[PDB]
Amino acid sequence: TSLPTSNEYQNEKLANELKSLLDELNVNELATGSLNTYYKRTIKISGQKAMYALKSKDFKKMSEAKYQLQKIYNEIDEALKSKY
Amino acid sequence: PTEKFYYIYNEKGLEVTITARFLYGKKVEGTAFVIFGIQDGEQRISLPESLKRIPIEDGSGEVVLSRKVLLDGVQNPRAEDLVGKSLYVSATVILHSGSDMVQAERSG
Amino acid sequence: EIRAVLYNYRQNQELKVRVELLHNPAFCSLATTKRRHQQTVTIPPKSS
Amino acid sequence: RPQDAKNTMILEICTRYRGDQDATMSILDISMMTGFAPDTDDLKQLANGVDRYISKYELDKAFSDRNTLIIYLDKVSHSEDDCLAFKVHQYFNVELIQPGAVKVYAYYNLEESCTRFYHPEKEDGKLNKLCRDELCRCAEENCF
Amino acid sequence: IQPGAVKVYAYYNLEESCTRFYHPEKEDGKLNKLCRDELCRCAEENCFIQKSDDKVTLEERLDKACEPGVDYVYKTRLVKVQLSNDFDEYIMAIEQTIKSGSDEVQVGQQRTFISPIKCREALKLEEKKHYLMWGLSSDFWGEKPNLSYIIGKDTWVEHWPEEDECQDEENQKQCQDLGAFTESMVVFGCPN
Amino acid sequence: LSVPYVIVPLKTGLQEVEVKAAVYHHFISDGVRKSLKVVPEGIRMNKT
Amino acid sequence: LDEDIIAEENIVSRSEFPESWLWNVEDLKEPPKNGISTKLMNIFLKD
Amino acid sequence: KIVLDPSGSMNIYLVLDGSGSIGASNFTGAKKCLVNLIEKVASYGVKPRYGLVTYATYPKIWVKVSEADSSNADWVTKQLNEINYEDHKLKSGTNTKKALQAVYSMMSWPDDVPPEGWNRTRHVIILMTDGLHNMGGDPITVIDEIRDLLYIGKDRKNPREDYLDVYVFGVGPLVNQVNINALASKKDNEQHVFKVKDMENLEDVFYQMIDESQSLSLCGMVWEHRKGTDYHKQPWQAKISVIRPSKGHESCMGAVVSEYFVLTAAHCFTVDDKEHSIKVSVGGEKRDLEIEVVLFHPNYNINGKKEAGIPEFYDYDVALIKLKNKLKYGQTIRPICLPCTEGTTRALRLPPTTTCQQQKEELLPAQDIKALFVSEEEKKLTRKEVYIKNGDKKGSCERDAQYAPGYDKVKDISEVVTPRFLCTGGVSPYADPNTCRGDAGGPLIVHKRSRFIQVGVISWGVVDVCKNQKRQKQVPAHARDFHINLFQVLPWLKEKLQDEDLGFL
């Protein structure tokens, strides 16, 4: 077949990255349940930003919510290692 | 350099920290190639095996010339004869885009 | 070969860029008046 | 043949120094053809190989956003050629592709250098030109 | 619409002040509240979920009374009405606890129901007649054993006629459905 | 910008008040939950 | 919902508003660099 | 949360909605949530009293906490599995108030005198519902009676809030959070509300509620939650690097067995290797632990038959390393269980009078036994499942060691293959991966009753399938790996580790 044209492969790559974090969002939203109220405040604010970005397919929001949801995921991972 | 001199009996050797940033003030990501050398009077002598290859991350890197490599570099095994001479450093840093290159020098 | 470096200093935003080399009567390239030499790339944030 | 079939091409680079001794550490500046992405796992073999290294920040990104590649060689032989190779695949679906380029130099001297191009139709990758004595013209066009 | 407000004070003293409100219906703009002595309740609501008699489709209405919001279903009979300050109380006798309740059933004694006195214009209940009622957990109010069931927008009231009024052709089918639902809810519950 | 609201206290003590706000076309929001004292009418007297 | 706004249920309110906090005690026993001990305290901020 | 103590006296009340709002396949997912939960609680060794109530219009009590059968995890699982969705479908109410009063009757003592241990006893209540109660009164007022009965939150001097925890699960396709949030207990930094998507990835749900305060040092217990790292997946796994001049860098694996001790193979080291040249990292930190001494087995000799014509001799290839400073156990650092110990008895849920031979019968039957080891792929730890060939193919597993390089023309098979070696590898009954040489020294792990037991130590393999530092591409099928049996060296381990108080039989 004809190979995918220009932006179509790039937008699909961004959607696959956002889809990967949303699979463990329910795990991470849970994982803040035994953590401090800041993490639980941050992830539910950051979670809807990723959820809307995937279904709206806006490039600006899908870029920002990818790095935003990655940031709180790093904070949770450092929280769970420091809490033991 | 951590110190602007070298004490001959320092077992760690001379440490030279690399700092690289863009002209407008943001951090440089790249990889540095750096080599050390010795200056005797007006004449400079180069140490070939002192070459190292370090990535420059967060706008920074660090390289050390150890005491053993300098003594292996010189053919004179006396540490007493090294006093009075001077060192120089020549570094070559290239960005990870590979589109530009800067050569710097610390000497004396 | 010419090297054009494009810089993105957003803290959390990667950018979709159309970049184009213009036609030149003094320089031969794929850019002519009818057919332009343009590309579509993506620059990650805090990177070049 | 093992049902991995796609539009596939392989790039091979070789060099040799002409001086009286082996040249020391040199650097490979490689630029992809437009819409071409290298096979990653071939460069994994090259980076971990002896006398060879690829920087981490360049290496771990890879895939479609890889257009310029930086490869460091610790030495090149002066008697015979040193070589390496990796695969490339098109993903962009565009005609009149831009040729790629490979430039060689050393860290102590950028000025003495050498640069060759490549294209899947033109031998030196320099496309097509017309020239009468000293006066040359652009010619990457249809004939009429 | 939200009422506006005007506050007056001086630059050397904010503490001594005065504040008045305004609304195009309310004189002081303070909307509507109910209060018995010191214990007050919110009252910016409809008086109750009044239906316009056209929905005689009781079979839909009674099946929708098995929704999880309903915390009591009672069959009552009004005895005596007394007006008061900004409210009026309706002394009713509970005949049977059809669904739920959350308190003791007792059955056969006086149970006081209270409405805002501005809701007399919406619907006037009449003494000695039977009435079928249901509400939710925010309706019963106060402290035990002086619990008080307050009539609000979520409370529903409909007259259950006497035996001779059922023999009229309009209340023929009405007394069927309310009688079947009485059996339907003390036998089968809700299937949700 | 200040947004006034009107409320009526119903029961004594340190009771809870909560408000929220969210912006359109961006996913930035804020919520404020504070408590304030509901005091019955009257005043301090220190007699002997 | 489908509209371009955060839904109300997942809006998380700020509520930790005390004026004075971080009433803590610590002892400088870190390695003395020029006689100076460098202590790192990772601390939560408030709302 | 929930405290797990071996002196535990805990009542676990399980309430399940059976109304028409749930759906049978959501009801089955509700049951599968509870069965893995009961099994994970029984993996600790705590004996709670289970209560099982399914309700619709009317509650039906299946297991009462007063019965002696309430402390049997296996029986309560059998009673829960038999319950069908359409068992009381014809009564399809949602009367949560009566079910809480039934739980209130369970905790209620007769007359005015509670039995002693009432303040000792912990209480746990678990509810699964749609959040749409429609029959009976308000359910919240029975909880206030439960709060008043247990004297919790009613005294400033002794608040007693740590004795009751209430969790609510949102099951069914349609769910009301508002009722569920009011029903659930509300505590700071403790998750008590679960939604419909929370029913998947059960290990993450259990990780939030469980507090392992009194159960830190339990051997062979794994956190399998999706956010867990390699060391949540393997708390015992220790990475051992030997960097010495001329010899160069070499890496081997180990397994935590005590606060001061790690078990690994002996051929990774030698007598000439110094203690400062050996670095061990257990929890994944870059801070390598310093060691005190390495205890070689007394009968180990790599050059035992060197004068006869055998190049390397791998009999008794085990060693114990002593740390300079002891470890502190955590979620990523825990020891692995050793056979014929009291910890292994509590792990296998055996009576305490179980002998060392009875455990030997269960762990090593004369058949193909499921097992696993750990390997590295691009600096990340991963699991490799193998089979121990202890059955009739044990002789065929030993015979493929003839193809080992350097040992092709050695005549006697019983000389080089001692009874210490356990044999894995091959393609029968299933394809078993072969170790890299960096994988040497690791444990051979067998899984029984939600716990993990070590039965061997990784020794050597016949064919080095990982010669080009990668295990890439297929290899011949007769490549076997050998592992040192722990039952053979049990008197040496019991002699050395009786000072560590592991409870040897």
Ligand SMILES: *C1O[C@H](CO)[C@@H](O[C@@H]2O[C@H](CO)[C@@H](O)[C@H](O)[C@H]2NC(C)=O)[C@H](O)[C@H]1NC(C)=O
């Ligand atoms: C509870 O209902 C079933 C129980 O397994 C699941 O139903 C999902 O929802 C609809 C059916 O109503 C299907 O289109 C999905 O494919 C179902 N499966 C999924 C999401 O895995 C589900 O687990 C539960 N939730 C809902 C909303 O039905």
Ligand SMILES: *[C@@H]1O[C@H](CO)[C@@H](O[C@@H]2O[C@H](CO)[C@@H](O)[C@H](O)[C@H]2NC(C)=O)[C@H](O)[C@H]1NC(C)=O
């Ligand atoms: C069981 O409950 C009692 C309540 O009476 C708890 O309080 C202890 O009571 C005994 C005797 O009345 C005192 O000696 C203790 O000092 C009390 N403990 C306190 C005040 O913390 C106690 O939790 C339990 N008593 C036991 C186990 O003897």
Ligand SMILES: [Mg+2]
């Ligand atoms: Mg129901």
